[PDB]
Amino acid sequence: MQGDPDVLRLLNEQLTSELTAINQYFLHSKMQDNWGFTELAAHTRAESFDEMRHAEEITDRILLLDGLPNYQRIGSLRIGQTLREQFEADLAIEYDVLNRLKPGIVMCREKQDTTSAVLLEKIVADEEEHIDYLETQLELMDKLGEELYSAQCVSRPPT
Amino acid sequence: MQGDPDVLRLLNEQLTSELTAINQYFLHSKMQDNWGFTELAAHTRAESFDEMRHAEEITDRILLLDGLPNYQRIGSLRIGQTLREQFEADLAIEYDVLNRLKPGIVMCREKQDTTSAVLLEKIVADEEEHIDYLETQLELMDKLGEELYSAQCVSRPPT
Amino acid sequence: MQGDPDVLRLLNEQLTSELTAINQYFLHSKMQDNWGFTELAAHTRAESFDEMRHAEEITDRILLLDGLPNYQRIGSLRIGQTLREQFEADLAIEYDVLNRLKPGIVMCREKQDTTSAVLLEKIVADEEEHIDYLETQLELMDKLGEELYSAQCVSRPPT
Amino acid sequence: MQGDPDVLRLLNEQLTSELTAINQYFLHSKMQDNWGFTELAAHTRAESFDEMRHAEEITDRILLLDGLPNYQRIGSLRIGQTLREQFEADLAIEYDVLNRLKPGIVMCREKQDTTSAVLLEKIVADEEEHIDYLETQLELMDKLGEELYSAQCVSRPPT
Amino acid sequence: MQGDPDVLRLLNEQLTSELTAINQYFLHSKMQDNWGFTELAAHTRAESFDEMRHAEEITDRILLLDGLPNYQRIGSLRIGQTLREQFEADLAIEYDVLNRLKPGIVMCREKQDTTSAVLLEKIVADEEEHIDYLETQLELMDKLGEELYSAQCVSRPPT
Amino acid sequence: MQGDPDVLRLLNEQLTSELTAINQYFLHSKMQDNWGFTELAAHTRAESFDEMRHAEEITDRILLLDGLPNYQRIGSLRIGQTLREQFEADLAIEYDVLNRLKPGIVMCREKQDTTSAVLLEKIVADEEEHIDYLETQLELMDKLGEELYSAQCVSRPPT
Amino acid sequence: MQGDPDVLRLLNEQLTSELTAINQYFLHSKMQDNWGFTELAAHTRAESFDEMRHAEEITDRILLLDGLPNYQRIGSLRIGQTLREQFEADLAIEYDVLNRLKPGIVMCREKQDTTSAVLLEKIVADEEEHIDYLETQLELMDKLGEELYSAQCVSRPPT
């Protein structure tokens, strides 16, 4: 059994994306924890875990289709030096995923590979949830003000 | 058994008020949860469930009296785009209920329909609490300030 | 994030459908209860809830896509006056959904909005099951005889 | 270890009969459930499961005697389009089994193959009971009325 | 309700394939058990059971669509006389499913029958997993050598 | 058994450091509790108990080394009069320990007293987490604002 | 609190090795599982998780020291093509760490940063155990024969 080659590139592309996200998300969570925004950092941590799970799932798909999963390649990280830049950085990678996946699923279906399209379909839904979560944080930051918003990310007492 | 025509019409009018309220309140909970005010959102969602229950209770009374429950007619929604706006809109519908129900109760008793009256008295009591809750929130927004009040409506961390 | 306008219009159209179904299904259930078809009534009730859930799900999708959910609009109720009439009425609405959704889905995918599409796919599947049930019920009335079918809808003793 | 050729041919014959039955019985059960006769459908389903076991049992025995089990061959399905037709079709396959097994056992015993004869005797006891159930159901259709009997086959409320 | 005649032929073809597989798989499990490869047989037996489930699922869909499930028609069995022959035989039936379904799902969507399409989309995923397992065992036979692989398919002690 | 003079001198210097800390931290905890900053106050108390254990472990090592633990000397306390002055005052002592134990740890390994050295290494590690926590608290006052950060140190409601 | 710039560069070097190892080890376990060597794959997975943990700890330390953990840089993966190539590759990376760390710790002690040294000493020790396991796996490959070794890496029955 061997996968369609355009599909495999697509998969590997997405995999590379997931790997970048695991790292960006994780380091952001540690940085959030270090700044003392512990309550937020757990959320951000969970996001990295979610991305890690996505990476494993793609990996299995690639392998079943007899491909080589690219563990070498890494994307470019945007590492935020503020909470606001951090959410912004995270937003950008998820948008990059949507931009790649929306066309990609259609291609997968045109290639008669429903299983792959289905996996990509799930990822897209998850990323949408994430983006929605991230944009709402920026919305809140303005509505509450930045300092007030930020106080909601610490614990009582902080750290 | 058959209801007094006037009472059934008052009951139907109240039903339309409930159906209106269920929607306005439910949508507002969805909106507040979506802007990330989740903790407030749970409260609003309950108040909507409360209206669902009233509506069912009015429906039962109507049917008992050989009436036709009107599920077709709906009131004019006031959808707010800030928390304040939302609170004020909900207040408005509650006030219309008191305006309708207060004479309506005195009429039910003249017609000798105590059971419909007691039902309506119960709704009045419930709407008075809601108004007290809403009116208070509005008070707090001023006392605390709007942003600070809003902050108390999000979890830690937010959403 | 922003939804394709057509997709959002589709979703809203479905919402309007759901809101009409909740009311028509609820009303029917209350009436079946009122006639003493308590057993049947509980199933119909459950159907109304399924719709209430479809309404919430669609409402979430719309908010996610920065759409404006329409809780103002409701459709034309078909309130049956016999079980057979109710069954036909309910069927008619379900068929309206299938007629809308089937092309709707194709469109969602062209527009590359899989998440919405999947949301609609589940709904279609759900409505197909509902139509099968109601159509079976009519077959049963014919096969059993109407009165004998109706007896299967009362508790022992009745109500 | 090597079986008698006549015996083995008899077992493969009975195996073909089972395979047929499993298909007929299962479909009929699926058919009764779709009609809304969920209560009868459960029993018929059980009857098919019973036939699955007999085919496994005969399958072991043939294998133990160094035989080739025939899973390629299927007999003529009789699919009923009414409950009465279904009960009759089911009875005919059952009587074909007794007709074959009764001389078939004496043959097994004559050939000095008791274990094989014992397995067949058990199938016969089992088929006799199924036949009694079926013939009784037809008597009940005449005793009760066909519609009234059919009403005994649905839940409350239906499906 | 009434489905597309093409969708119903595809579902019926697939039904034939499922019944063929249930049979080849089950016999193969029994042959492996007979040979003393008990640990392996249990796995094989599960696979035939998985196909029994797919057969039922297809059946429900066909009946929902007012179609007539074909339980009379069977495929051509390939019964293997070695473990290697069996894996290859089973692989051959799976590849065939993939051949049928890959175009058919595209077709099902074209005809706006998402529920039938999703169902087959699921069978594709399952068959893909089963192929992956089967291709792996054959690879394990070359890597380990056949006798050694075979050793891994028996209990301690055997049967 | 006899400790090296230089080492014992170092253990005693540290012991003095620990008693000073116990007092300074315990009083800061009590003052913070007085001020109504009860939630922070609990974390501070815990820091004091940590020091109390450190003193005891040093005392035993000194006793095991035939030394005379100094429970008569104390350093100067910096009692802070705001939350900010307390955090700076605590940090200042923390740094005074690191400055002493860094060269001290090297010296112990030189006189060949690994056990004493490791005891110190642990203290240093512990002391490091303490500094990072305090240095993070001061940043948060800047980031959140002093009034806001302080509101994260009280309970709901205050004390 | 600022770490020594040399120590920080070392921590970052090691982080780089850890990210490299996490990927290699994870891919290798995914590949082994794929080949059906399930039993070995689980251990290999556990190894990758260990480096995931190493990575996290080193990250805290750099953050504690006001450092910037490099999650951008990854090293050359050596992906193995047989169980043997896989063991030999993972070994090579492990040896690279002992090489880097042996002098780094000494350096850390000189710059007087024991807590960093201690973390590294703990990595050096775990790495030794890993090397000893892998070295032993190769040895058993010779003692048993590659085929026989491999047979102990699969379950009964395989995958």
Ligand code: HEM
């Ligand atoms: C790149 C830096 C990474 C960091 C800092 C990291 C960190 C962690 C940590 C600390 C855990 C908890 C596991 C345990 O307690 O043993 C974990 C879980 C896991 N990681 Fe990673 N990891 C990284 C990369 C990866 C990659 C590239 C993969 C590829 C799949 C991966 C796969 C997993 C999986 C499958 C889990 C368990 C998820 C679960 O518990 O549901 N990790 N990670």
Ligand code: HEM
């Ligand atoms: C947009 C309109 C509505 C929406 C979104 C909505 C949504 C919901 C939901 C999500 C539930 C919880 C269901 C569960 O148990 O999982 C519910 C409950 C209920 N609904 Fe509705 N519903 C709506 C309209 C109505 C209407 C018109 C009535 C008519 C009287 C009604 C009657 C009820 C009742 C009686 C409950 C049980 C309340 C409780 O105890 O929590 N609902 N609704």
Ligand code: HEM
């Ligand atoms: C080749 C002849 C077949 C044999 C020998 C066979 C055998 C069996 C056996 C032994 C069981 C377990 C029975 C029990 O619990 O009492 C079973 C279960 C089942 N059978 Fe069959 N069967 C056959 C064909 C079929 C067919 C045609 C269908 C219908 C399409 C079917 C559907 C099922 C289902 C749905 C289960 C339960 C599945 C589960 O629990 O995982 N089987 N079969």
Ligand code: HEM
């Ligand atoms: C200078 C003022 C001090 C104050 C106000 C103080 C206060 C306290 C108090 C109230 C307890 C709880 C007692 C109990 O549970 O019965 C405690 C526990 C303890 N104290 Fe002190 N203490 C001081 C100094 C010290 C000193 C100098 C040492 C050792 C040299 C010390 C060692 C300990 C230890 C080891 C505990 C055990 C509680 C635990 O951590 O499990 N304390 N202290």
